[PDB]
Amino acid sequence: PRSFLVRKP
Amino acid sequence: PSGVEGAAFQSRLPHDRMTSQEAACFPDIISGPQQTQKVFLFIRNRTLQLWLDNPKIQLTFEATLQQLEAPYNSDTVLVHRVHSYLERHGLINFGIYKRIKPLPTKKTGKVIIIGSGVSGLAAARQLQSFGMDVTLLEARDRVGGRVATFRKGNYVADLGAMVVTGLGGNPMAVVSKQVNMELAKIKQKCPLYEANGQAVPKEKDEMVEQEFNRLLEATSYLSHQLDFNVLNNKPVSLGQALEVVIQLQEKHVKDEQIEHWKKIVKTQEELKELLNKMVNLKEKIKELHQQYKEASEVKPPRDITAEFLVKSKHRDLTALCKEYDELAETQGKLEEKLQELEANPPSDVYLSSRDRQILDWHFANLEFANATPLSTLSLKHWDQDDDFEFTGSHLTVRNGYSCVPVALAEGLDIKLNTAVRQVRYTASGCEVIAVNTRSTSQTFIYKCDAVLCTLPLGVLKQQPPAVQFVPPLPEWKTSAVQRMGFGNLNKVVLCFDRVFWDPSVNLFGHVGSTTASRGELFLFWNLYKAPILLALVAGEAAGIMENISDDVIVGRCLAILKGIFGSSAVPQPKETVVSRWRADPWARGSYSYVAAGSSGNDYDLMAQPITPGPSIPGAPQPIPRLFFAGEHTIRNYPATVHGALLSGLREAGRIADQFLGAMYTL
Amino acid sequence: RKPPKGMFLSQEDVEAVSANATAATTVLRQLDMELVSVKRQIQNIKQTNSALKEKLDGGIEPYRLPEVIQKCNARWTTEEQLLAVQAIRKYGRDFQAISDVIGNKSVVQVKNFFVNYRRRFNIDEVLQEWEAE
Numbered sequence A: 001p002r003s004f005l006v007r008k009p
Numbered sequence B: 001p002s003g004v005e006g007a008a009f010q011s012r013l014p015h016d017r018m019t020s021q022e023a024a025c026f027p028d029i030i031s032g033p034q035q036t037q038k039v040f041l042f043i044r045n046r047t048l049q050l051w052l053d054n055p056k057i058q059l060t061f062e063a064t065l066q067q068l069e070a071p072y073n074s075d076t077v078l079v080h081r082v083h084s085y086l087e088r089h090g091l092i093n094f095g096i097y098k099r100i101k102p103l104p105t106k107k108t109g110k111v112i113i114i115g116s117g118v119s120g121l122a123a124a125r126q127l128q129s130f131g132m133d134v135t136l137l138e139a140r141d142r143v144g145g146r147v148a149t150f151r152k153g154n155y156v157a158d159l160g161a162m163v164v165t166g167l168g169g170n171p172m173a174v175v176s177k178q179v180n181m182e183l184a185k186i187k188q189k190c191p192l193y194e195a196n197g198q199a200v201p202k203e204k205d206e207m208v209e210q211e212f213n214r215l216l217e218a219t220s221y222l223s224h225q226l227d228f229n230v231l232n233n234k235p236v237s238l239g240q241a242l243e244v245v246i247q248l249q250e251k252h253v254k255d256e257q258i259e260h261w262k263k264i265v266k267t268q269e270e271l272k273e274l275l276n277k278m279v280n281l282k283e284k285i286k287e288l289h290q291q292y293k294e295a296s297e298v299k300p301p302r303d304i305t306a307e308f309l310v311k312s313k314h315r316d317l318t319a320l321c322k323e324y325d326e327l328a329e330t331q332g333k334l335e336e337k338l339q340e341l342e343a344n345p346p347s348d349v350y351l352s353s354r355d356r357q358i359l360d361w362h363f364a365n366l367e368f369a370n371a372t373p374l375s376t377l378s379l380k381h382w383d384q385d386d387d388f389e390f391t392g393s394h395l396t397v398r399n400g401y402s403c404v405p406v407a408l409a410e411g412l413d414i415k416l417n418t419a420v421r422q423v424r425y426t427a428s429g430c431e432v433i434a435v436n437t438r439s440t441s442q443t444f445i446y447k448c449d450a451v452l453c454t455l456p457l458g459v460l461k462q463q464p465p466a467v468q469f470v471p472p473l474p475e476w477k478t479s480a481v482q483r484m485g486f487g488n489l490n491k492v493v494l495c496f497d498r499v500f501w502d503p504s505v506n507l508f509g510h511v512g513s514t515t516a517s518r519g520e521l522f523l524f525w526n527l528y529k530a531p532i533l534l535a536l537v538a539g540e541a542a543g544i545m546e547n548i549s550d551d552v553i554v555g556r557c558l559a560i561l562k563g564i565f566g567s568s569a570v571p572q573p574k575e576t577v578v579s580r581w582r583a584d585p586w587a588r589g590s591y592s593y594v595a596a597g598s599s600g601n602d603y604d605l606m607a608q609p610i611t612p613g614p615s616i617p618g619a620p621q622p623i624p625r626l627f628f629a630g631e632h633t634i635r636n637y638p639a640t641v642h643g644a645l646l647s648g649l650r651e652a653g654r655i656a657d658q659f660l661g662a663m664y665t666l
Numbered sequence C: 001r002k003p004p005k006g007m008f009l010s011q012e013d014v015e016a017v018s019a020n021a022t023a024a025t026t027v028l029r030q031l032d033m034e035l036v037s038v039k040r041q042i043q044n045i046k047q048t049n050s051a052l053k054e055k056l057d058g059g060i061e062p063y064r065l066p067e068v069i070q071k072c073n074a075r076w077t078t079e080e081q082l083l084a085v086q087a088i089r090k091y092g093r094d095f096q097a098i099s100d101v102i103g104n105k106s107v108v109q110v111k112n113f114f115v116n117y118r119r120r121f122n123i124d125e126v127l128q129e130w131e132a133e
């Protein structure tokens, strides 16, 4: 999923 | 969102419109007058709110009709239909609640559930809630499957799912009220720390990150507006498209240096011509002046043809001197322009070995998020599930995520250490063949009306098969299984006696040395009460670090940590755990990803249940008997606990509708 | 509708870089080689202009002549009548020059002077002998 991305902008 | 409309949002439903699922159960209202729809919609919206404000006691029909006002509490079958629909499809009275109306003495129907992953537990708990006989088969000796949780003394750390991705419309919000879960919030700040051992400075840190997000958007622009989605008959991956974007950005940097210098030579070559006219006038001038001193040497008195000669030469020379002056005029502008043109030279490089490596850490980030090399993700579809992201902060579970499966498991018939080896489904029913994991010789047979399969996609993918289907799964299902992607990302847990990291930063990167190792220990998490640091192994590195002893892996971790905090602040770790999800035979990977050549539609194929052929030929088409749940079955929420849980809720409702009948469609 | 700003992604470039495996690197090398070639040309021409620049050292200060501050006049002494005919022989109709040569008459003075003495000084024949060269 793209939602796990850390430090999301 | 707040009020009844907030309940709709907190339940992933539009408040002002009826879903495709409701149109199924209330076709009488969707095609009817808009007035009744808004009634219905309000009738649904209030009901969720009542469950939502108090999700530790069952919401009974009566309790719901009590607390409605007129005109809404006038049609009692509407209220009964709505409340029944909701309860059935797990929107209310799911999870762990005190039951008001106790269980029916005798159950109806028998269902075998393969796996007590969260999807499994969730369905089992719902089916039992519906008065069905439900048995879960479990290859492991513990519940929760990919919700794994280390414990030793006060040390606690998840090797599996670790973050709740926001409570805004998350079913795990409900669970969190229903079970003592200490949810600690994650602080977004994350300092990168390259291979030397020192922070990347904000100026750089911010600009790579800015380029990174810019790079992602570009790819989005390649697939959607330029249709760059096939290339040599093969589907374009996100990884390829990132390279094709960088290349077109590296080409642009050169293309603009060329343009710059080309302007410079256009002027320098036009200045050259100018000097030629000036070094040719200075000798028409040299010779005219000579001719004038000679004509002026003839002392007077002189006849007019000789006086005219001096005046003529004097005029002619002045003309040329004006002319040459107007050209050191122009010889001046161009000289100024040249320092301007050079003075403003455009960038020499797009990115450099420094830049290009911090950029590789933002790619290790993506790889960890999708648990796979960016070369395997689908360019078009890798982010398809992003419309449904939750709102609110991202959270951790200070007491370990395990406490949730364990909580769900109470009251349930769970056979642990039972590995299913074969599933046989026929028109009259099914029988599952399992063994004892400890002593493989002992064999078990379970006969049932229907099998709910929550086997991991990695398990399902296994060749040769770890579970035989009799009859074989149809081609349309098995091609969805190939086509799909089941990735991998392991973790390394570091238990110390003392805190030596910044205790107010939760997470900090390590910038790798190579593109190839961009994922190898590229991120550490400080999440827990106890002194535990947790290290991620993502991307291509995850698969390979599994062929390496823990000791060696911990060495690399210690070396990376020492560089950050000094070779003497970093003690020896008291307890160390590194797992192996790709090697775990009850997982065979970590979670799913939209592989190149797949789509989210494949996630829908995975959820279609299987209906076998008729026993006696000419018999009427039977009931479906094999159902599928789990993380790789819920298109909108794949690889993300709620999604598992949500898919288990889904199958339970659709199995009940099948074997118990729907008394809410009339 | 468009990329992010600064990203350069036209359809043509993408094919050009996807045409084979190494097409992207091959295209980048040609620009790389091309930039080096233009750079060497720039230095080459710098040298040349630097040589042509030294031949012009000192400008024309030695070859310049002081300005003649002189008032105008409309009387034609026989002398500057004669300067005139000769200048008309030498400069065709460029009155600024013929003004410059005479020194004490303006273009109008020269300009009017043509018609007045055209019969007497045979300016007609003088003119067509200017043409010949």
Ligand SMILES: Cc1cc2c(cc1C)N(C[C@H](O)[C@H](O)[C@H](O)COP(=O)(O)OP(=O)(O)OC[C@H]1O[C@@H](n3cnc4c(N)ncnc43)[C@H](O)[C@@H]1O)c1[nH]c(=O)[nH]c(=O)c1N2C=O
Pocket: A004, B114, B115, B116, B117, B118, B119, B120, B137, B138, B139, B140, B143, B144, B145, B146, B147, B159, B160, B161, B162, B163, B164, B165, B418, B419, B420, B421, B454, B455, B456, B459, B466, B467, B489, B490, B581, B585, B586, B587, B589, B590, B591, B629, B630, B631, B632, B638, B639, B640, B641, B642, B643, B644, B645
């Ligand atoms: C390392 C890691 C980190 C995270 C996440 C995932 C991972 C891997 N995931 C994904 C979730 O695990 C997934 O949603 C769910 O666990 C699937 O969970 P699920 O799909 O519902 O089931 P399961 O695979 O957990 O359980 C399958 C069960 O089936 C059993 N089984 C298998 N073969 C069998 C057989 N033959 N016979 C009998 N039983 C068999 C197996 O042992 C287990 O008991 C996260 N999810 C989330 O929300 N936040 C997170 O932080 C994370 N996390 C990190 O980011």
